[PDB]
């Protein structure tokens, strides 16, 4: 036969399974694989095979456009009955890879096929009975995910009269296989699968739900089940929006048809290809990092690039920068620990974009975990032991503090929290470890994380006539563990009002339908610096630092303000460490010390009542 397959003998399934036409289509597929090429004249599939072999991979991606344009009839038959030609093309790819690389079977006995660029797109609610046992391409959102389970591929059986081990028998992934005759006993007696001499593959089940955006008004999002096999497992996690090309078929097994009621059958999708609709770096961008670091004014360069969608609040942005970089932890002789994370508190009147800052930090940081003292949140703040909704097994889950170890924990509406959660934060901030004694489990968990919090003053309006301690419901033990306290006052000023109003209105009109570093490079910059930089100190700045500390102590005690304590000195050193880190340098400079002094002194002075604040402004006017 030669391109005469246009003649149909019977139904397509019957036609495709005849041996002669099987050889015909196998050879035709061979010709497609070995002779296709685009205008450029480069071997697309040859290069694909080369990279597959060198990488030691197991699957070929194929383009439906190329296949259809070359051998359209094959494309139509594929759309109709994909089941058989997947096997045919699997054998084709196997022999081709054998031709290129010798004895590839030593490492891999099978190479799979993943189709792509299917023309028609469907939504989960459009499937009907006419689409059964065909090729489909749908798009949705992952909602639940199971573990990875082993499934039989090459089964062996034990004869229980003679201890013979019967040879491999392929598992078709359609029903379980059985045997009835022993070659040596000539018998038919009992048999049992051999666990040790069997070869398995990977199995996973996923639940897709329609994306809420697209459902027309007044309807609900439908859902379906999806099956992933072999190397398609653990490729997508909950919350990611994906497109899947697979085979739509019934659960022909069901359970049984003796069930009472109407004869209704369930359906599933067997996945063939899956595709979603980073902080790693390389030398090319490492030299770029060094080149940018060598520039002057890098501190302002970075600061100007945070939260581009908010106007002003440079103190807020620089505090966020410092806490986002962080210092270096220390431990003297393994018996005296000093934390290296910088804690920032935001205290502002309503309508100030504090939540916007928190969301930006969430989107930008490597490991940011969100929580709140009120409202819906995917996770709480206290460690607990809970039953698993699906696996029906006890599990031990820590709070956001535990889950965000070596990361950042964001808390929204910090002032409305309850007793348990307040206790949990106090423990985490004081010790950086959460204890637990429940359900027979007694243990401790690491909770080394940087905290960013937001709150509102009593009555919703700040009272500048009183000290910060009496403007909030928080208590001194929890308030003293922060090192960057930012206070935002909604004082009315004309020029500021015009600037903010034009900002907002212009943003809206742009969003109507009908200097700063790029963010993509910035995240990698953060990751690389945190991974590779550990600045140190020089013993020639002790005189300056000690003189400054003595001066602040004297002035504070003279004015009768909140006491200045070595906690502030430690915060200054930590912030200078972070500043030196952001430059990629290895040593701390007097400029960094000056900036840290500025930040800490300004933060301390700004939190006093009016008279004390005015008195201290003149005293510390050097900065």
């Amino acid at each position: 036969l030669e391109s005469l397959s246009n003649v149909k003998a019977n139904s397509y399934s019957e036609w495709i399974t005849q041996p002669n036409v099987s050889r015909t289509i196998a050879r035709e597929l061979k010709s497609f694989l070995l002779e296709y090429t685009d205008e450029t004249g480069r071997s697309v599939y040859g290069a694909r095979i080369r990279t597959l072999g060198e990488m030691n991979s197991e699957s070929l991606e194929v383009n439906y456009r190329h296949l259809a344009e070359s051998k359209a009839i094959l494309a139509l038959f594929l759309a109709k009955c994909p089941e058989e030609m997947l096997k045919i093309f699997d054998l084709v790819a196997m022999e081709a890879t054998e031709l290129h690389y010798p004895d590839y079977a030593r490492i891999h006995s099978e190479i799979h096929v993943r189709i792509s660029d299917f023309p028609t797109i469907y939504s989960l609610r459009e499937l009907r009975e006419s689409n059964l046992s065909s090729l489909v391409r749908v798009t949705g959102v992952v909602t639940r995910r199971t573990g990875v389970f082993p499934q039989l591929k090459y089964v062996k059986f034990n004869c229980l009269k003679c201890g013979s081990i019967l040879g491999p028998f392929f598992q078709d992934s359609n029903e379980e296989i059985r045997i009835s005759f022993c070659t040596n006993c000539k018998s038919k007696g009992p048999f049992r699968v051999n666990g040790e001499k069997t070869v398995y593959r990977n199995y996973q089940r996923v639940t897709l739900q329609e994306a809420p955006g697209t459902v027309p008004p007044g309807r609900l999002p439908r859902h379906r089940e999806v099956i992933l096999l072999a190397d398609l497992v653990d490729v997508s996690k909950p919350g990611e929006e994906v497109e899947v090309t697979g085979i739509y078929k019934n659960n022909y097994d069901g359970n049984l048809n003796a069930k009472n009621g109407f004869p209704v059958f369930a359906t599933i999708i067997e996945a063939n290809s899956i595709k979603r609709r980073v902080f790693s770096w390389t030398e090319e961008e490492e030299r770029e990092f060094r080149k940018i670091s060598r520039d002057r004014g890098i501190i302002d360069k970075i600061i100007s690039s945070m939260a581009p969608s908010i106007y002003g609040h440079r103190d807020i942005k620089t505090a966020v920068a410092c806490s986002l970089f962080g210092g270096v932890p220390k431990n003297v002789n393994g018996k005296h620990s000093i934390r290296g994370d910088i804690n920032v508190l935001l205290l502002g009147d309503p309508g100030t974009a504090k939540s916007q800052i928190l969301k930006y930090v969430e989107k930008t940081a490597h490991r940011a975990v969100f929580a709140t003292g009120q409202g819906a949140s995917a996770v709480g703040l206290t460690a607990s032991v809970r039953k698993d909704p699906i696996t029906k097994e006890w599990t031990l889950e820590g709070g956001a503090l535990v889950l965000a170890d070596k990361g950042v924990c964001l808390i929204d509406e910090f002032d409305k929290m309850n007793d348990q959660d307040r206790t949990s934060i106090h423990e985490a901030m004081e010790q950086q470890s959460i204890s637990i004694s429940k359900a027979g489990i007694v243990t401790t968990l690491q909770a080394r994380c940087s905290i960013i919090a937001a709150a509102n003053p009593n009555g919703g309006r700040y009272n500048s006539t009183l000290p910060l301690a009496q403007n909030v419901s928080l208590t001194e033990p929890i308030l003293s563990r922060f090192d960057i306290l930012c206070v935002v006052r909604d004082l009315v000023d004309e020029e500021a009002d015009e600037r903010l109003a034009t900002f907002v209105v212009d943003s809206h009109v742009r969003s109507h339908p009908e200097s700063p570093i790029p963010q993509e490079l910035l995240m990698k910059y953060i990751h690389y610096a945190r991974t590779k930089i550990y600045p140190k100190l020089h013993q020639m700045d002790m005189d300056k630092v000690s003189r400054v500390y003595a001066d602040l102590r004297r002035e504070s005690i003279s004015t009768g303000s909140f006491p200045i304590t070595v906690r502030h000195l430690e915060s200054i050193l930590r912030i200078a460490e972070s500043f030196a880190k952001m430059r990629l340098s290895e040593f701390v400079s007097s400029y960094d010390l000056d900036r840290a002094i500025k930040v800490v002194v300004d933060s301390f002075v700004d939190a006093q009542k009016v008279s004390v604040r005015r008195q201290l402004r003149r005293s510390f006017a050097i900065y």
């Binding site: 030669e2 070995l34 002779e35 296709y36 090429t37 040859g46």
Partner: protein
């Protein structure tokens, strides 16, 4: 001079698509002729690839060499004509080999 051209810059391959529905016996016969030509060209040192790309310089084919213009643009022979790559019939290849005087007939323990 032809041998120099061959062993220096001749990238070759053979079309595996046929224009006749021959029986298995004749298919095996032309395949044996193909193998003989392969060994003949190997003796002269030209490269024999396993896939068409613009780098290839001779294709050797069973189909008609006078009716390339009727084929598809995607067709391998059409590509060859567009790239000015030299196309031979099996008879032409055998003639070239004979003219270059390439004889085809010729632990435990």
């Amino acid at each position: 001079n032809w041998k120099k051209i061959m062993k220096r810059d001749s990238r070759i391959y053979f079309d595996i698509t046929d224009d006749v529905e021959m029986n298995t016996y004749n298919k095996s016969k032309m395949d044996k002729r193909r193998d003989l030509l392969k060994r003949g060209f190997l003796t002269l040192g030209a490269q024999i690839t396993q896939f068409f790309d613009t780098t290839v310089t001779i294709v050797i084919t069973r189909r008609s060499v006078e009716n390339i213009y009727l084929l598809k643009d995607t067709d391998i022979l059409s590509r060859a004509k567009k790239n000015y790559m030299k196309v031979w019939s099996y008879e032409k290849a055998a003639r070239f080999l004979k003219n270059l005087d390439v004889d085809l007939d010729h632990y435990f323990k």
